[PDB]
Design an enzyme around this catalytic site. Structure first.
Site, short mmCIF file in Angstrom:
data_model
loop_
_atom_site.label_atom_id
_atom_site.label_comp_id
_atom_site.label_asym_id
_atom_site.label_seq_id
_atom_site.Cartn_x
_atom_site.Cartn_y
_atom_site.Cartn_z
N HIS B 12 0.76 -1.36 0.00
CA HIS B 12 0.00 0.00 0.00
C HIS B 12 0.78 1.40 0.00
O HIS B 12 -0.05 2.43 -0.16
CB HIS B 12 -0.97 0.06 1.15
N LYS B 41 -6.11 -10.70 -6.20
CA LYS B 41 -6.46 -10.16 -4.88
C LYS B 41 -7.77 -9.27 -5.22
O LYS B 41 -7.77 -8.43 -6.19
CB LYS B 41 -5.34 -9.34 -4.30
N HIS B 119 0.10 -3.79 8.63
CA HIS B 119 -1.25 -4.22 8.15
C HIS B 119 -2.22 -2.98 7.87
O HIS B 119 -2.22 -1.96 8.62
CB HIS B 119 -1.77 -5.28 9.22
N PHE B 120 -2.95 -3.23 6.80
CA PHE B 120 -3.98 -2.08 6.46
C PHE B 120 -5.30 -2.65 7.03
O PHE B 120 -5.82 -3.69 6.53
CB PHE B 120 -4.07 -1.71 5.00
N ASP B 121 -5.79 -2.02 8.10
CA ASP B 121 -7.05 -2.41 8.66
C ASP B 121 -8.22 -1.66 7.96
O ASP B 121 -9.12 -2.45 7.62
CB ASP B 121 -6.96 -2.21 10.15
#
EC number: 4.6.1.18
Lengths: 124, 124
Positions: B12, B41, B119-121
């Site tokens: 990202h 994805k 991590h992209f939450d």
């Protein structure tokens, strides 16, 4: 509504820097914290130690706050703080700040349940 | 082996762009970032601010992650991100994505020593 406990962390906590690392810490640091949103907030202190190391000051030396109210506490240990001051010349939407790195004891006002810092009173 | 953050950065970080300039940013990026190698994805967001400023969310507002883990963090400032959605018509080896651009608050998972985004939450 933004809480008083979250406001303090937003305006004064910065645990990823060990201290202001350059003369630009304040100009950016202050804006990102939205502290230049309606106007030049004129002075602001940032702490670069753990939220816990800081929430813990709420159990350190009880001192009278500058406002006469008694919910204040002073850091036993000195802490890395970055002081941020509007320069003469600083002017809403171009707010400008002098960044001073220091190690001093801080005074915060404490409130609610966890007992944590809700207002930054002063560094000594 | 690629680190979780090098991986975060590949999946990202997008610091060369103020934002996606066309509906095709998404199809272009998804493939180059190696995310369509074994399968298409289906969903993924790119952030268009300096790594410095994303790593900076790691000291921002603590928030609960989608999984109940609390090493998530929410951005005080809003950020420009490009949202990429798998489209009907997209068929693994031919992945197609809808590109959505907005200025929104982001949520990162942080981990390790430097404390960085792993991590992209989510975006809000």
């Amino acid at each position: 509504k933004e809480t008083a406990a979250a406001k303090f962390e937003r305006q004064h906590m910065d645990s990823s820097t060990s201290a202001a690392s350059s003369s630009n810490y304040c100009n950016q640091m202050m804006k990102s914290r939205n502290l230049t949103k309606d106007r030049c907030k004129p002075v602001n202190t940032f702490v670069h130690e753990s939220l816990a190391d800081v929430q813990a000051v709420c159990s350190q030396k009880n001192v009278a706050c500058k406002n006469g109210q008694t919910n204040c506490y002073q850091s036993y240990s000195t802490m890395s703080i970055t002081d941020c001051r509007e320069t003469g010349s600083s002017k809403y939407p171009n707010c400008a700040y002098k960044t001073t790195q220091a190690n001093k004891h801080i005074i915060v006002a404490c409130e609610g349940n966890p007992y944590v810092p809700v207002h930054f009173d002063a560094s000594v």
